Structure formats: C-alpha cells, structure tokens
Design a protein around this ligand. Structure first.
Ligand SMILES: [Xe]
Ligand SMILES: [Xe]
Ligand SMILES: [Xe]
Length: 263
C-alpha cells in the first residue's frame, strides 16, 4: 500500500540511512510493494534461516540427521551463545542447534551448523543452486555482521531474500516435513519481540527472524497473516544509521503497523 512506502521513506529520512523493503504474496508469489529491491544490505542473523534451510535439504537427502549429536569446545564459543554455552558437556543435536540459531539467534550454533554444510561458500553454493545468484555469505559469526559501507560480503537484496524465503518455506526444494520444521523454528523466535510482532494483532500468525549488526544494521524477514495462517512474506533491512537499537526497532514496528493497517 502507498502509505506503507511512505513509512519506509519516513524511516529513511529519520534514520539517515537506506531501507530496503519487500511485500510478497506467499500464494501467488506476486511482489505487492517494493523499495530498493535490487540494493544490497547485510543479512546479519537473517542468514540463519537460509543456513538451516541448507541443513534441512541435507536432512532430506540423508546427508544429515536431525538427531545427530555434535560435541564442541569452549574454544568454539563466540560472542552471544546463550544456548550453546550451556551444553559443553552433553553436546547438542542438529535439531537443537537450528532451534538455538533461529529462535535465539545463537552465534556458535550458527557456526557449528555452517561447519556441517562446509562453510559460507557452501551456503552460497546452496543458494545459487536454488536459483538465488544474488545472496552471498562470505564469513562466520561474528565477523559477518561488520557491515562495512559498500562491502558486498554477507549481503542479500530485499527481492533475493524475499523470493528465496518463499521458496524455502513454500516451494519445491524441501520436503513437507522440513518446510514445516523451518517455519516452526521461525514461529518460535524469541528475539524479535519489539519488531513486527509488536504491531501484530491477536490471532495473527507470524514466523520470523531478525538481525542486527554493526553500523546501524537492522532487519527482519517474516511470513505472516491473519487467521493464524501466513499469507505474506515481508523483508525489511537497513544499514548505515547512527540511530539507537530502540529507534531502529520502532521504525520497523511502524512499517509493520502500516502493512497490517492496509492488509
Ligand atoms: Xe509460510
Ligand atoms: Xe506486522
Ligand atoms: Xe527500518
């Protein structure tokens, strides 16, 4: 809706930074609104949904099992590892590592999972092979959040990310069981409370994944809809602002309110 694009423009001007935006009909696959759709933005932790998409594709092929237990070391623990720091002794299953990476945005969980698929280059190869030749992961946690201006490492475009998420969630790539698992992890997101969720009316469905990084980088990807059923994908990114986390949160929530208002 035109009003939602105004909010996005509002946000650009108030944050002093680029904002990228896509609304995508999940059923028809039609793009409903777009803003800077072909511009690059750091993915930050939003890449963790793609990562577990790659992991689930390996589970489908039998190259990975959700119950496989991975043990690791104190040395493996990087900044912000709220779940993995608790399981040095017992290890964690692949299933638990994806849950930690997606619902809590656990950084060591994401690095361990990246190791299982062969690293950033292999995540990018996975995306390439499902028809996303735009998104690229180059680095590990936490360096992938560096968001150096004009640095294309670890970036996506709002359009690439929106269509890739649609394919992972509703397309032919993953089995029905793996699609449902991916969206189930996203629905159980615990670290995106002040964002789209804050504008979400009672009874609406949302499955999402947020991200934040250096140099004002902030974003979210989501499938949402009324009546407890997703019907739309929404992608919002920003980078470059000197604004506080709180202000960037409110801008995203404000864009959310307009999207919901004009559904
Ligand atoms: Xe979905
Ligand atoms: Xe929302
Ligand atoms: Xe934003």
């Amino acid at each position: 809706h035109p009003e939602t694009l105004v909010k996005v423009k509002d946000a650009e001007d108030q944050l002093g930074a680029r904002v990228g935006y896509i609304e995508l009909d999940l059923n028809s696959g039609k793009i409903l609104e777009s803003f800077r759709p072909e511009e690059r933005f750091p993915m930050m932790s939003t890449f963790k949904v793609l990562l577990c998409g790659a992991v689930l594709s390996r589970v489908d092929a039998g190259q990975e099992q959700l119950g496989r237990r991975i043990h690791y070391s104190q040395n493996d623990l990087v900044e912000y590892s709220p779940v993995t720091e608790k399981h040095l002794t017992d290890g964690m299953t692949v299933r638990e590592l994806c849950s930690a990476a997606i619902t809590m945005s656990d950084n060591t969980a994401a690095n361990l999972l990246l190791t299982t698929i062969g690293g950033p280059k292999e995540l990018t190869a996975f995306l390439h092979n499902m028809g996303d030749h735009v998104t690229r992961l180059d680095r590990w946690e936490p360096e992938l959040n560096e968001a150096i201006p004009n640095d294309e490492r670890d970036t996506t475009t709002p359009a690439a990310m929106a269509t890739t998420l649609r394919k992972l969630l509703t397309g032919e790539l993953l089995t029905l069981a793996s699609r449902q698992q991916l969206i189930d992890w996203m629905e159980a997101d615990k670290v995106a409370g002040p964002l789209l969720r804050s504008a979400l009316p009672a009874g609406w469905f949302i499955a999402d994944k947020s991200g934040a990084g250096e140099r004002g980088s902030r974003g979210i990807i989501a499938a949402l809809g009324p009546d407890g059923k997703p019907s739309r994908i929404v992608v919002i990114y920003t980078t470059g602002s000197q604004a506080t986390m709180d202000e960037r949160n409110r801008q995203i929530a404000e864009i959310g309110a307009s999207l919901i208002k004009h559904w």
